[PDB]
Structures are given as structure tokens and as C-alpha cells.
Amino acid sequence: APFVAPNVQGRVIKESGYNTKTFKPAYVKPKHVIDPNMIIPRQPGEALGTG
Amino acid sequence: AGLYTTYQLLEVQRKLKTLPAFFLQWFPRQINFQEDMIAFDKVIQDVTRV
Numbered sequence: 001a002p003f004v005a006p007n008v009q010g011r012v013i014k015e016s017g018y019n020t021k022t023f024k025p026a027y028v029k030p031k032h033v034i035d036p037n038m039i040i041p042r043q044p045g046e047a048l049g050t051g
Numbered sequence: 052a053g054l055y056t057t058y059q060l061l062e063v064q065r066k067l068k069t070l071p072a073f074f075l076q077w078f079p080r081q082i083n084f085q086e087d088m089i090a091f092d093k094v095i096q097d098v099t100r101v
Contacts, residue, residue: 044092 002011
């Protein structure tokens with residue numbers, strides 16, 4: 001607090017305000033194409049020979 | 052004595068030496084198969100991508 005000789009008025013004290021933060025979320029979009037070149041070939045569980 | 056020395060047999064000392072199983076503890080799975088060959092399919096899946 002300010003020391004102020006009691007013979008005088010007093011001292012005016014300043015203030016401070018405040019702030020805000022604002023954010024937009026980002027966007028994510030992966031995809032696969034699944035044409036036959038991927039469906040046909042033998043997958044690991046398939047028996048050798050026939051499948 | 053005379054004809055032959057008499058004897059007492061005391062019990063037989065059988066040392067049966069063996070090779071106890073150690074490495075087979077990491078091969079617990081057993082497959083009996085009549086096919087010509089065994090086959091593995093090993094897959095790497097790099098799902099760590101962003």
C-alpha cells in the first residue's frame with residue numbers, strides 16, 4: 001500500500017484486465033481403396049495350395 | 052573257501068546318467084504333421100503412423 005502523509009487526499013491505484021484464448025479443432029480424413037488387387041491375393045491364414 | 056571263495060552280495064550301485072530337459076522349455080508347442088513341409092507366414096503391421 002502507498003504511504004501517504006495524512007494531510008493529503010490519498011493515492012489512486014490502477015487495475016488490470018483479463019484475456020481470452022480461442023481455438024479451432026483440426027480435421028483428419030484417411031481412407032483406403034480396396035479394389036480387387038488387394039482382395040484377391042492369398043492372405044496369411046489361407047492354406048497353401050488351394051486356400 | 053577251498054573250492055571257491057564265498058561272498059556276500061551288497062546292493063548294486065546303479066548310476067543312470069541322463070540329460071535333463073532345459074531348452075525344451077521354450078518349445079512347448081507341439082505339431083504332428085504328415086505334410087511334406089511346415090510353413091510360416093509372418094506379417095509386419097506398422098500401425099504407428101499418424
